[PDB]
Each structure stands twice: as C-alpha cells, then as structure tokens.
Amino acid sequence: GSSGSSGPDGPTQLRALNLTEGFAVLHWKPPQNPVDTYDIQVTAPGAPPLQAETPGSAVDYPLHDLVLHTNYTATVRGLRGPNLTSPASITFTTGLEAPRDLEAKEVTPSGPSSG
C-alpha cells in the first residue's frame, strides 16, 4: 500500500531514448545523491565484450561500433566509495531505421502452378 517515491544510490529506471543517425546511447536517472563513476558493461550473443566508464558529471553514455542487427545488453552501475550501487540493464536494438523494413512486411509468397 504505502509506497513512497525514493531512489537508490545508483542509476535506475533505465529507458531507451530515440537513436540519432544510427546512434545508440544509454539514459539513466540520477539518484538523490550523484555518484563518482558509472560502470557500464555491454555484451551480446556473439558480439565482442565492451567495457567503459563515465564521470558522475554525466547522465548519458553513447555507445558506438554496435552491430545494427544485434541486441546489445548494457549494464550501468554506480561506484560510491568502497561499495557499489544497484545495476541497471536494458535491451535496445541498434537498428531502428530502414526502408520498408519495419513498417512494410517485405513478404513475397511464391505460389506457381503447372500441369
């Protein structure tokens, strides 16, 4: 019942913003208290592992060199002292722009005949 609004020490409510000119980036909400460094981990089934970091003075980390047709899983964290914060993962495709690819069906059923 009684559910108040509060935020952890790390990034939460991770959402996938609209990519730009084929640019995939992460978006997290800064908790009451800002962290020092955010630990992000990008991985996928087959794709090479990617590791990076960003200063607490940042609320977004744009990832590049991502395979369009490939789901890259990122995991952001919050480095607060000798301890860590709650990790935040989200699924976002690196391909949200193409002609007659998403809207169209692009299906051509072949049904010839003979006799």
Report the helix count and the strand count for the chain, using DSSP H and E: 0, 8
Please give the CATH superfamily to which domain 9-96 belongs: Immunoglobulins (2.60.40.10)
What is the layout of strands, in order, in the sheet containing 60-63? 12-15, 24-29, 60-63
- Residue pair 11/29 in contact by the 8 Å Cβ criterion: yes
Give the burial class of 26: count Cβ atoms within 10 A of its Cβ; 0-12 exposed, 13-18 middle, 19 or more buried. Answer: buried
Burial 65-92 (b: 16+ CB within 10 A, else e): ebeeeeebebebbbbbeeeebebbeeeb
Secondary structure string (H, E, C) spanning 34-84: CCCEEEEEEECCCCCCEEEEEECCCCEEEECCCCCCCEEEEEEEEEECCEE
**Structure-solving method:** NMR
The domain spans of the chain are: 9-96
